Amino acid sequence: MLIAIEGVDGAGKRTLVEKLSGAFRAAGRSVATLAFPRYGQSVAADIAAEALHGEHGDLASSVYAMATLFALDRAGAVHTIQGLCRGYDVVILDRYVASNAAYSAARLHENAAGKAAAWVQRIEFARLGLPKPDWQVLLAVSAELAGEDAELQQRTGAVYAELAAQGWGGRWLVVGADVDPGRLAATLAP
Amino acid sequence: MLIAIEGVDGAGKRTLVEKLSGAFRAAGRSVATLAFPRYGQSVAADIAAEALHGEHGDLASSVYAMATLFALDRAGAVHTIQGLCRGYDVVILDRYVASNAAYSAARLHENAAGKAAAWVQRIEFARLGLPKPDWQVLLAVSDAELQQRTGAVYAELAAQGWGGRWLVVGADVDPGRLAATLAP
Numbered sequence A: 001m002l003i004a005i006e007g008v009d010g011a012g013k014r015t016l017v018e019k020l021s022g023a024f025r026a027a028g029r030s031v032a033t034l035a036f037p038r039y040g041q042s043v044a045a046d047i048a049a050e051a052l053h054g055e056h057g058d059l060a061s062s063v064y065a066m067a068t069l070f071a072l073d074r075a076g077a078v079h080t081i082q083g084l085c086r087g088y089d090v091v092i093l094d095r096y097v098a099s100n101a102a103y104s105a106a107r108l109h110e111n112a113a114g115k116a117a118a119w120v121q122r123i124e125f126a127r128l129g130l131p132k133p134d135w136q137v138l139l140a141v142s143a144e145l146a147g148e149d150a151e152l153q154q155r156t157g158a159v160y161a162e163l164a165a166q167g168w169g170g171r172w173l174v175v176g177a178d179v180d181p182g183r184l185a186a187t188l189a190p
Numbered sequence B: 001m002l003i004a005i006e007g008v009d010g011a012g013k014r015t016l017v018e019k020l021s022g023a024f025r026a027a028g029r030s031v032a033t034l035a036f037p038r039y040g041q042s043v044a045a046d047i048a049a050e051a052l053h054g055e056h057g058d059l060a061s062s063v064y065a066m067a068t069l070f071a072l073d074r075a076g077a078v079h080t081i082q083g084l085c086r087g088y089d090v091v092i093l094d095r096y097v098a099s100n101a102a103y104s105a106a107r108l109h110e111n112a113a114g115k116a117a118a119w120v121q122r123i124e125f126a127r128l129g130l131p132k133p134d135w136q137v138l139l140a141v142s143d144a145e146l147q148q149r150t151g152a153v154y155a156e157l158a159a160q161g162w163g164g165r166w167l168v169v170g171a172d173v174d175p176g177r178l179a180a181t182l183a184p
């Protein structure tokens, strides 16, 4: 079973990953985790990071260019993902394909039913063959928390919620920070 | 020996690659060739071409974004390239790193000593580890404005010895004499 944890930076994804991993293991499930982007391993991820810090000329200003780098990062990890899924009861990803849809649409001032989101779905799932998550869990935060570029983050949190409402790429759950971890594990892996 | 053939689109590189291969093989050397971008083989290459036909939103409008995709295409081929060099007497590339420098600088209205050219050299040769060609052969021949500036940037690159030794040839170059000149 493949689960993706999603949300804006500072939402608290890492803590939720840990709480859920513990809840799963307490129920007898084995768990492996993997975080995107794979900063430090993926050349495409590290070029993207450098672009975010002002390197590589005009690279970061293209929305689709940055999205492509993150997709190439995941494509490089497809064998790892499949290996974990065969070897473990539950694989939890800290960010997956939906992160690309949310930030790309937000940067373009689009919504979840717009072009950017559909482009991501086509290129990452259909073309690159990345495995679809069984669950996408949105750790949803307020506009005030998201902004703390501030506007870009706020628009990303709104797209995320739209993606969850539309069932983009599969089933979603929407949770808050202080989620009941044993209840969530029972819901995700029934 | 690694040789890269360079020039503006339509210069006739493909014909020159063919003739040069024959001259080498007629001289007793084994030869392999490889063309960049690796359209149809590279995900990064095919996205770049699609972007050139108006696809992938704003991607094609970023000069460095397009350059990065072409660099990532080559990075995907670095071992392929090294394998051919170990396996064959002569490896001829139809376009290589200098193409990225020439089109990128030209699109930025920069020259060969400007930022883009130094950036290509840095990310492709030093960081991604692409092997420096033994020879870069510029086929200099007789939007159009972009193509014109690219051919001049190309000549500047050859004049400065960018990335290694260059030869500048015209349309009627003698392929057998050029092979003899390149030959070790």
Ligand SMILES: Cc1cn(C2CCN(Cc3cncc(Oc4cccc(Cl)c4)c3)CC2)c(=O)[nH]c1=O
Pocket (backbone or CB within 6 Å): A009, A036, A037, A052, A060, A066, A067, A070, A071, A095, A096, A097, A099, A100, A101, A103, A104, A149, A152, A153
């Ligand atoms: C895994 C993943 C991650 N991301 C984001 C995740 C958040 N970071 C950090 C960030 C967080 N909040 C605002 C930011 O400003 C910019 C500025 C320029 C480009 C982008 Cl994509 C974002 C940047 C950027 C990549 C994607 O866009 N796509 C992905 O697929």
Ligand SMILES: Cc1cn(C2CCN(Cc3cncc(Oc4cccc(Cl)c4)c3)CC2)c(=O)[nH]c1=O
Pocket (backbone or CB within 6 Å): B009, B036, B037, B052, B060, B066, B067, B070, B071, B095, B096, B097, B099, B100, B101, B103, B104, B143, B146, B147
């Ligand atoms: C192998 C390679 C190739 N090229 C070019 C070669 C020429 N083609 C075709 C072309 C020829 N002449 C003008 C063009 O206009 C554009 C339009 C958009 C982007 C770019 Cl880079 C060029 C396009 C584009 C990629 C690079 O820029 N870098 C490379 O590394």
Ligand SMILES: [Cl-]
Pocket (backbone or CB within 6 Å): A007, A008, A009, A010, A011, A012, A013, A014
């Ligand atoms: Cl977070």
Ligand SMILES: [Cl-]
Pocket (backbone or CB within 6 Å): A025, A029, A030, A031, A032
């Ligand atoms: Cl475990």
Ligand SMILES: [Cl-]
Pocket (backbone or CB within 6 Å): A142, A143, A144, A145
């Ligand atoms: Cl708020």
Ligand SMILES: [Cl-]
Pocket (backbone or CB within 6 Å): B007, B008, B009, B010, B011, B012, B013, B014
């Ligand atoms: Cl040509």
